[PDB]
Amino acid sequence: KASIADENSPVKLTLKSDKKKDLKDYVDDLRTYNNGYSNAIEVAGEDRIETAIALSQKYYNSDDENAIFRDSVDNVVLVGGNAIVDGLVASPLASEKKAPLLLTSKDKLDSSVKAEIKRVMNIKSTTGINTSKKVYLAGGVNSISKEVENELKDMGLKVTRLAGDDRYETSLKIADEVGLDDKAFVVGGTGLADAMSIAPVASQLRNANGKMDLADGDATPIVVVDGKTINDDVKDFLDDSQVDIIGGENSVSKDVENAIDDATGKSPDRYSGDDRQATNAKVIKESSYYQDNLNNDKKVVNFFVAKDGSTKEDQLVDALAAAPVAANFGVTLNSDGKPVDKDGDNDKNKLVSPAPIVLATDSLSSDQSVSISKVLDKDNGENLVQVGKGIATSVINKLKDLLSM
Amino acid sequence: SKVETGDQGYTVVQSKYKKAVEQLQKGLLDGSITEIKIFFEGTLASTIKVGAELSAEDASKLLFTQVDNKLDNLGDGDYVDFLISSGITKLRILNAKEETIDIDAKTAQDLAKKYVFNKTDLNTLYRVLNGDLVEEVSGKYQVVLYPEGKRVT
């Protein structure tokens, strides 16, 4: 008694058990797997270009649930395919600019990408292309050539290039576009895997107090410096900012840390481990990164998975495009900035729950397991996303056990 | 007063057609059912009021006459609903398949990879099964479940 069913419900199920306890073990198993087959997703493609495209089509300008935007976008951040050196910091850029970060080839603007640009911006054959839509090109001429820049300009789009004479100068030009409203992040460029572990945190639209504000909030920029001392420009950029330096001594030397000490007058916090995975673990278990950024009274329920730089550091570019997605996750926004399900206590900032990107290709470390177990809520996992191909099933199996999905 | 999905009431499969109507008929005669309103595909079929110059013995025969042909030729997505009044009660007859899983023996991970269940239904069911409906039928503790659909592959 007490519930009538859908007209088209295929089968009527009855669970017969001698004891109620054995039934609880079967309903819980059913509840976990049912919510562990529909909530665990996979976004990937054969090449890194279509992977970023599929990551865009699902979370940007898509009618499905668990997307970032359900309507047209006005900006797009474009980065080269093999442009991990110059464009790593574009994740907070795509975040504040409320733009999908897309990967293009160096010399030829892919037809797949150009279609995605027009699609995500609601550009169609009956609408004229004006300077109301911008395409931010992050990187130098080896990231996005002049051939691609002039094509995007020929259509009529406003093309803003964020480039410099060096990778370190390029990142400063990018971090200048990202509003430093008094915290920052520093990475060395020797370890790019450690920098990708901090991309989801830096891309969060956060408030002054450290909580999350998707309206009138800003994301925290990242800077790449040599690890030596602090040059004339980065010291000017860092005025009274709380630097959260990322990486070991081999990435950024203690001299570079001491120079920041003398520059900004604040003590820089240091997150580092012997391995690129251990650095990821310490970033996830940091309270002020994920747990304390939540306006709601829950813990970390959303999680992401991506490859690392063990096989090839180039493969880590998959986690770069997923950072703007993992930062603003758990809420879907329309043109006016209101939450939806198909249309529409339930405030946006109270509903946002960002997701840390876990770096693992072959196996998941014990430190990463302990760290991920610390941040999980009592009610356990609610969304897991696997970005890219080549991730071992061993890792995904361990994740589903940690998150109970 | 209207019948619609996700409401408090009874659900019968076409396999249990013969039994459901018997209980409605025997309830109608033994002064236990006063009024019945039949709904074919969410549209009103006819109203049986024992007090509308009718009788219980006539209403019992009338009820079976209307729905014997409809319910014997049910199609996927076709349903017959009743608003049973005892003085209140809601019923829906549909043509799904019935499958019983005796756990004292299909595991749950094979069940989930095939059917899509509502989380809010399983959430409440788990809670009321351990602490804060489930029936005891002939030494067993049975629980009925209605999936929303089949799982994508």
Residue numbers in the entry:
A (entry chain B): 3 to 183, 185 to 230, 233 to 349, 356 to 416
B (entry chain A): 5 to 91, 98 to 115, 119 to 145, 152 to 172
Can you quote the paper on this entry?
The surfaces of most bacteria and archaea are covered with a proteinaceous coat, the surface or S-layer, which is formed through the self-assembly of individual protein subunits into a regularly spaced, two-dimensional array. In C. difficile, the S-layer largely consists of a major S-layer protein, SlpA, which assembles into a paracrystalline array enveloping the cell. The major protein of the C. difficile S-layer, SlpA, is post-translationally cleaved into two S-layer proteins (SLPs): the high molecular weight (HMW) and low molecular weight (LMW), herein referred to as SLPH and SLPL, respectively. These subunits then form a complex (referred to as H/L) that is incorporated in the S-layer.
We therefore hypothesised that the structurally flexible and less conserved D2 domain might be dispensable for maintaining S-layer assembly and engineered a mutant strain devoid of D2, named RΔD2 (producing SlpARΔD2). Analysis of native S-layer ghosts from bacteria producing the SlpARΔD2 revealed that, despite lacking nearly half of SLPL (145 of 318 amino acids), an S-layer with identical lattice parameters to the wild type is still formed. The reconstructed molecular envelope retains the paired globular domain organisation, but the outer surface lacks the staggered ridge feature seen in the wild-type EM reconstruction, confirming our assignment of this density to the D2 domain. Importantly, the absence of D2 exposes pore 1 between SLPH tiles (middle), which is occluded by interlocking D2 domains in the full-length structure. This creates two openings in the array of about 16 Å, which could indicate a more permeable S-layer than in the wild-type structure, with twice as many pores, of slightly increased size. Moreover, many of the residues lining the two exposed pores in this lattice are not resolved in the electron density of the SlpARΔD2 and could not be modelled, suggesting higher flexibility and, therefore, potentially weaker interactions. Surprisingly, strain RΔD2 displays susceptibility to lysozyme, unlike the parental R20291 wild-type, which is completely resistant. Although lysozyme has an average diameter of about ~30 Å and the pores observed in the RΔD2 strain are only about 16 Å, absence of D2 seems to be sufficient to allow lysozyme to kill C. difficile.
